[PDB]
C-alpha cells in the first residue's frame, strides 16, 4: 500500500508564525500524462469531520484562506500555513487518492503558543439532588489558561486525596487559544458529611504561587 509518513507529529507555534507540515509517500502519486499529483491535505477541528484544504498537492479549495499553501510533487509534499491564527488549531492529515487503498498520514497536531495566562479557579459544592442519592461530586474548574500544564490536588480537612478524583481538559480554544480543566472529586454522601473543608490546590506557571480554592460544607 502507499504509506504516507507525516512530519512532525506535534507542533506549537505562536500567532503570526509560519507552520510547515510535511508528508512523504512510499510511492509516487504522480500521474505522468497530465503531471497531476493525487494528493490532498485535510484539517480536522475538534468535534468535526475532516475538512478538505488542498487538492492536487497545491490547489486551494474555496473558502480556505490564502495563508494555506500546498507544495511538492511525486513523493515529497508540504503544507505551509502562513501567519498562523487562533482558528488554525486542529489536526492536519495528508491523503493519497492515487491507488487503492486510500491512505492517510498519521496526523499532525497543531497547537497555538500564546502568552502565559493564569487560570481563573472556581469551585462547586455537590448539588442537594446529587446528595439526595448516596454520592457527592466536588468540581474544581480551571478556566481559560495557557500553557496546558497544570497541577490540581484535592485536600479534605488538609488530607491529600488520591484515587478518588478525575481530570478532563478541553481542546485548545479556537478564539483565545486557552485551555480549561475540570477536576472532579467523588465521595459517597456518608464520607462527604464527615468532613468540613474541601480544597482544590492549583499550581500553574501563570500563578504568583500555588493558589487554593476551598469551601466549608
Amino acid at each position: 500500500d502507499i504509506v504516507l509518513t507525516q512530519s512532525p507529529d506535534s507542533l506549537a507555534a505562536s500567532l503570526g508564525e509560519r507552520a510547515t507540515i510535511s508528508c512523504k509517500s512510499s510511492h509516487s502519486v504522480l500521474y505522468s500524462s497530465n503531471n497531476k499529483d493525487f494528493f490532498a491535505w485535510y484539517q480536522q477541528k475538534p468535534g468535526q469531520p475532516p475538512k478538505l484544504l488542498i487538492s492536487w498537492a497545491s490547489t486551494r479549495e474555496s473558502g480556505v484562506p490564502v495563508r494555506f499553501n500546498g507544495g511538492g510533487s511525486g513523493t515529497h509534499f508540504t503544507l505551509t500555513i502562513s501567519s498562523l491564527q487562533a482558528e488554525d488549531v486542529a489536526v492536519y492529515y495528508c491523503q493519497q487518492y492515487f491507488s487503492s487503498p486510500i491512505t492517510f498520514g498519521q496526523g499532525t497536531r497543531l497547537e497555538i503558543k500564546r502568552t502565559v495566562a493564569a487560570p481563573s479557579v472556581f469551585i462547586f459544592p455537590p448539588s442537594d439532588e446529587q446528595l439526595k442519592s448516596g454520592t457527592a461530586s466536588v468540581v474544581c474548574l480551571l478556566n481559560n489558561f495557557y500553557p496546558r500544564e497544570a497541577k490540581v490536588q484535592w485536600k479534605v480537612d488538609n488530607a491529600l486525596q488520591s484515587g478518588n478524583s478525575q481530570e478532563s481538559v478541553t481542546e485548545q480554544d479556537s478564539k483565545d487559544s486557552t485551555y480549561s480543566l475540570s477536576s472532579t472529586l467523588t465521595l459517597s454522601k456518608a464520607d462527604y458529611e464527615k468532613h468540613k473543608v474541601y480544597a482544590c490546590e492549583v499550581t500553574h506557571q501563570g500563578l504568583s504561587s500555588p493558589v487554593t480554592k476551598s469551601f466549608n460544607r
Binding site: 487518492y97 487503492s100 487503498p101 486510500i102 496526523g107 481563573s120 461530586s137 468540581v139 478532563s168 475540570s182
Partner: protein, 225 residues
Amino acid sequence: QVQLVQSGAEVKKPGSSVKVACKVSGGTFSSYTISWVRQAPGQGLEWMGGIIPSFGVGHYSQKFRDRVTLTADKSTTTAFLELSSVRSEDTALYYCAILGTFNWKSGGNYFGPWGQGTLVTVSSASTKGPSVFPLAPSSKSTSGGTAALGCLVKDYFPEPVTVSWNSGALTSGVHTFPAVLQSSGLYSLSSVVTVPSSSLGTQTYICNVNHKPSNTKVDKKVEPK
C-alpha cells in the same frame, strides 16, 4: 452541494453485527464512490473501503476486507457500512465520505462532503441515561464581573451526550469537557459557561442534555446557590 447524514451513535455487544447508515442528499448516487473512514482513538484516520453503487462494486483495505461489507439502498439513496464480529477494538467514530481513487473509476469525485460521524461503542455494558446535576454559581465561582456555572452530566453509557445552553442561545463562554470513564464503567462530564456576574439575578440559565442512545432529554435550570 451534496450532504451526507449518518445514523446515530450506537452501542453493540461484542460479536454482534453493526450497520451504519449514510444518506446521500441529492437523490442519486450518480458516479460517486461512497467511502468509509474509521477514526479510532490513537490510530488516526484509516480508509476501510468504498462502494460505487451505480456499478455494484466495492473495494476494501486488507485490514477490513474479511469482516466488512458495503451495501446501498437505491430506493432511499442510503449507503450502509456493515461490520461483522465487532470487538472492543472497533469502538470508533465511523465516517462516510465521497472519496474515490484514480485506480478505481472515480467519476472525478475524489473529493466530496463528509458525513458528521457515527460513534460505535462495542461493549457488554447496558445503555444508561444521564443524571444531570446543577453546578450552582456562588461567591466561590465568581471573579469580579465573571461568574461560572454549569451542569454535571453523570452515570451515562455510552457516549455521547450533547449539551447546549438556553437551547442553543448561549454559545460564548461555553466549555463542555470530554467525558471521562468512571471507576463504575459509566461516563461523566461537566459543561460550564462563564457569564456576566451581574446577570445572575436577571437571566435564567438552562442546560439542555441530550443522550440519544437512551432517548433521554433533560433540561435543568441552574440557579444561584
